[PDB]
Amino acid sequence: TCEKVEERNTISLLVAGLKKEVQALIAEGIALVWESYKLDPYVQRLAETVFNFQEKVDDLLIIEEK
Amino acid sequence: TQVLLXXXXXXXXXXXXXXXXXXXXXXXXXXXXXXXXXXXXXXXXXXXXXXXXXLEESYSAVMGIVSEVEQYVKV
Amino acid sequence: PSGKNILVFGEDGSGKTTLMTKLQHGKKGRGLEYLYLSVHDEDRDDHTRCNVWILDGDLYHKGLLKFAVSAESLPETLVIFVADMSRPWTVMESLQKWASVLREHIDKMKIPPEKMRELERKFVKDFQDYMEPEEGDNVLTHNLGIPVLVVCTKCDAVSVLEKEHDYRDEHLDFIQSHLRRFCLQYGAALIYTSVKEEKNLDLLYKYIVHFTTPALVVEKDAVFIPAGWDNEKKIAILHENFTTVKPEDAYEDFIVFLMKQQSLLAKQ
Amino acid sequence: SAVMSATFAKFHPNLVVGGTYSGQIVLWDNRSNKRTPVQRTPLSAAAHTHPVYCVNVVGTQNAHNLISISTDGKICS
Numbered sequence: 278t279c280e281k282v283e284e285r286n287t288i289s290l291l292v293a294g295l296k297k298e299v300q301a302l303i304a305e306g307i308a309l310v311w312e313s314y315k316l317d318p319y320v321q322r323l324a325e326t327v328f329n330f331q332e333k334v335d336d337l338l339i340i341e342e343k
Numbered sequence: 344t345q346v347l348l349x350x351x352x353x354x355x356x357x358x359x360x361x362x363x364x365x366x367x368x369x370x371x372x373x374x375x376x377x378x379x380x381x382x383x384x385x386x387x388x389x390x391x392x393x394x395x396x397x398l399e400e401s402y403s404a405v406m407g408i409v410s411e412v413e414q415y416v417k418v
Numbered sequence: 419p420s421g422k423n424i425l426v427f428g429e430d431g432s433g434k435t436t437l438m439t440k441l442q443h444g445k446k447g448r449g450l451e452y453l454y455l456s457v458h459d460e461d462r463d464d465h466t467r468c469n470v471w472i473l474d475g476d477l478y479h480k481g482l483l484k485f486a487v488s489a490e491s492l493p494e495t496l497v498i499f500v501a502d503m504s505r506p507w508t509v510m511e512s513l514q515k516w517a518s519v520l521r522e523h524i525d526k527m528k529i530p531p532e533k534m535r536e537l538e539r540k541f542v543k544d545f546q547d548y549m550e551p552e553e554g555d556n557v558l559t560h561n562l563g564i565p566v567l568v569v570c571t572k573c574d575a576v577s578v579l580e581k582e583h584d585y586r587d588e589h590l591d592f593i594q595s596h597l598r599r600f601c602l603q604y605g606a607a608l609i610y611t612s613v614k615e616e617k618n619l620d621l622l623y624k625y626i627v628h629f630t631t632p633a634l635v636v637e638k639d640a641v642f643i644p645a646g647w648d649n650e651k652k653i654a655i656l657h658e659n660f661t662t663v664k665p666e667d668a669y670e671d672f673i674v675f676l677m678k679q680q681s682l683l684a685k686q
Numbered sequence: 687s688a689v690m691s692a693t694f695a696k697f698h699p700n701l702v703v704g705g706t707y708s709g710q711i712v713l714w715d716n717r718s719n720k721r722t723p724v725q726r727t728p729l730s731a732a733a734h735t736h737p738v739y740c741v742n743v744v745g746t747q748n749a750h751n752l753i754s755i756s757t758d759g760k761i762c763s
Contacts (some may be wrong), residue, residue, distance in 0.1 A: 279674045300677045310686040317730075323727055335720070356421070356467075359485060360452045363471075366481030367448050379430060379447050379475050400445070407444025412452040 278327075278334035291337045299326045347413070354360060360416050364409045377401055422468035422627050423495045424455070425486060426569075427519070429512045432502035433571035434472060437611055441619060449474040450482035458623055459660065461519070467628065468496075483523050489531060492538060495564050496623050499606070502571040503579065506593045507673035513600045521562050539563065546605035550646035557650045558601040559574075565626050566606035571617060574612035583668040588661040589672050594641055595656035601648040608643035616640050652680060687712060691740045697747035705738030711754045711762070734758045 692704025
């Protein structure tokens, strides 16, 4: 999704917010190393936000071209 | 202009309007601002999210200006 | 009588459609709306074809004025400068702007005939010279000349204008005196207009182009400046009653890689 | 994901499903403006750990039970 967003910066305009939210969760995963308690909830947040975010990038690509 | 392409004194009177309905089309073919109207002061709505006020009514406005020019010649 | 003319110059609307409606329409988005007049010629409709051109905006209106004014049309061309009192700064700047557009029309379209230059400029000195007498020394007139007259709209809203930002004779009389300043400097006049009131426009247009007009300063809401009621002394007298004597500052008063490189330090 | 045994869906010919190597099962829908799976399974403990080798339909549209056999000794209907 971010390659479709960086190679087509017109999508990046409407993606940036949710992109940065997934980036914040990614930064959380980058910051901690071997955090057995916050591993699974961050994995859930990463997967759910990237799932929704994937739908956002694809849906925004379609809507912007429409 | 394409449609507009002593009793003989009315020709010089109608030619002024027929030639007057052509100078507005010399605005570099686009002009990017052929709209003269605006909306109201919005508080909590979708004003900038829509097109604009004059954006949805200027084409018919300038389209009707030439019709007014044509309808006000013979009388 | 030959072909009379009228050039109404609406400033972004300013009740110009309402003004031509009360006098005698699809819409207005570009300008140059050719209109004819069937004015009572004191007997019947003698085909007084006083053509009216509704010019609004500045998006290529010089060609519109070029087709709206012929060679022999110049003496019988009653130009009308229109702006509404709801925005006083618009009238103050737009009157100078319309005078500038008229000067552009004279400096660009009136300049080819040489005989009309030496005859029209003398007739202009005659008109501005015969603009003021027969009413019952010298005003700083500019070089503009054609039948000039101004018309201000939204005049039956003095209570609204004083409730919003005037609330003193300074602003109202300031507008009146400064429009009088521009009228005395342009050799013009000024006939106000209102909603279903002040039936006074057609009087000076039928009068000058060959039904007279009144003048009012007592009402202070319907102020009519006829041809000749613009002098460089009453302007200073009007903006002296609690207002500053000739100010130049009160005009504005009444006016992937990116984020990953950022988070690279978070991994440590 | 690496889909393994993407079988049909009884009374849903166009709503094709498929178990994956990741341990999740993916449900596609060609007529949902997404050839990518529209109903993905998260890889939590509810789903399977080891690869899902055999997703398969059990029963008609009334009891559309989709058993997804995995290599974990755990299946999911």
